[PDB]
Curated annotation (Swiss-Prot):
May be required for DNA interstrand cross-link repair. Also required for checkpoint mediated cell cycle arrest in early prophase in response to mitotic spindle poisons. Possesses beta-lactamase activity, catalyzing the hydrolysis of penicillin G and nitrocefin. Exhibits no activity towards other beta-lactam antibiotic classes including cephalosporins (cefotaxime) and carbapenems (imipenem). This is DNA cross-link repair 1A protein. Induction: During mitosis. The mRNA encoding this protein contains an internal ribosome entry site (IRES) in its 5'-UTR. This 5'-UTR generally suppresses translation while specifically promoting expression during mitosis, when cap-dependent translation may be impaired. Changing residue 295 to A: Impaired nuclear focus formation, reduced interaction with PIAS and increased sensitivity to cisplatin. Belongs to the DNA repair metallo-beta-lactamase (DRMBL) family. It is found in: Nucleus. It comes from the Eukaryota. Binds constitutively to TP53BP1. Binds CDC27, which is itself a component of the anaphase promoting complex (APC). Binds PIAS1. Expressed in brain, heart, kidney, liver, pancreas, placenta and skeletal muscle. It comes from Homo sapiens.
Length: 341
């Protein structure tokens, strides 16, 4: 049965709740972003409205094959009526097409659902700046003070440097980047740009990227592997046995791979900075971990919540154990006492 933190009070609306069958009373199913935990359940056979962003809509049509009529894309930053309830979609600064949703209830309550987000100060000068938010449904993925990680711009800097050094040292080396969902496209697009290349990838990955409304995308990507010296592979495949296997296929065209694994947090964030990173090495193949995050650090989350001063907070991540729930509430109480709301 659909959990209460996926339902919006005083509406027929649910959020990211596609895996339970029909939910009784639900006139509308909102989808925050195209990640499989959030969409798990959709198919071609859905005949209830789905409201989502334009970009999420393209992925729904082309990757899952939902029928154009049931996909209601909405533009961002635009006051929109949806069954006589005003709603707004806002950029979540997560993956392509990811949004947060502002719900304006008939009774006067205002609810923000963040979906998955990486909180940022530019959100403090959006339509949120204009009025009070009573209830916050919050992405709590990294709600604990151990979780620090660098800025996205810091990480992209490091990457543009590593890659370009190597390629200029050895002109027969390949850059590989790992992937398993949408998100983090900046890693590979930045590397390719510095190297004067398109990015090469499988047919299915190319299809997915062609749904994202990236400007100039035809100039940036290709399915011709031979012609490219930045390749994307499955994240499963980013290891030595798999990279050897792949290094064979290229047919004596490169004599060294240099790979990047964009990851979330790992325990090596506790004791090692970004300028002081190293790879594992089994012969000519070198694998970097780079902590490029599309979720809020603890500090970024904390600042966003203390600015918003919500009357109530409902976590949507790490809610499956009493210990995590209890740990999170304690942080929420500190934040509230510090900030005086
Ligand atoms: Ni996500």
């Amino acid at each position: 049965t659909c959990p209460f933190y996926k339902k919006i009070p005083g509406t027929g609306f649910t959020v990211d709740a596609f895996q339970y069958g029909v939910v009784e009373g639900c006139t509308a199913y909102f989808l925050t972003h195209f990640h499989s935990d959030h969409y798990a359940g959709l198919s071609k056979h859905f005949t209830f409205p789905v409201y989502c962003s334009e970009i999420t809509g393209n992925l729904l049509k082309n990757k899952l094959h939902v029928q154009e009529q049931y996909i209601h894309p909405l533009p961002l930053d635009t006051e929109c009526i949806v069954n006589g309830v005003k709603v707004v979609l806002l950029d979540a600064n997560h993956c392509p097409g990811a949004v947060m949703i502002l719900f304006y209830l008939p009774n006067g309550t205002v609810i923000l659902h963040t979906g998955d987000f990486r909180a940022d100060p530019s959100m403090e000068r959006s339509l949120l700046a204009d009025q009070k938010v009573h209830m916050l449904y919050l992405d709590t993925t990294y709600c604990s003070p151990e979780y620090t990680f660098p800025s996205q711009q810091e990480v992209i800097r490091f990457a543009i440097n590593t890659a370009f050094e190597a390629v200029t040292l050895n002109p027969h080396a390949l850059v590989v980047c790992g992937t398993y969902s949408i998100g983090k496209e900046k890693v590979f697009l930045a590397i390719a740009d510095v190297l004067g290349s398109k990015v090469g990838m499988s047919q299915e990955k190319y299809k997915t990227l062609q749904c994202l409304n990236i400007p100039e995308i035809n100039s940036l990507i290709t399915t011709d592997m031979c012609s490219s010296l930045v390749h994307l592979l499955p994240m499963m495949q980013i290891n030595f046995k798999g990279l050897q296997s792949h290094l064979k296929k290229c047919g004596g065209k490169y004599n060294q791979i240099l790979a990047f694994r964009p990851t979330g947090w790992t325990h090596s964030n506790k004791f090692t900075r970004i300028a002081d990173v190293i790879p594992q090495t089994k012969g000519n193949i070198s694998i970097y971990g780079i902590p490029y995050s599309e979720h809020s650090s603890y500090l970024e989350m904390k600042r966003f919540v203390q600015w918003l001063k919500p009357q109530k907070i409902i976590p949507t991540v790490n809610v499956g154990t009493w210990k995590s729930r209890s740990t999170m509430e304690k942080y929420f109480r500190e934040w509230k006492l510090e900030a005086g709301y």
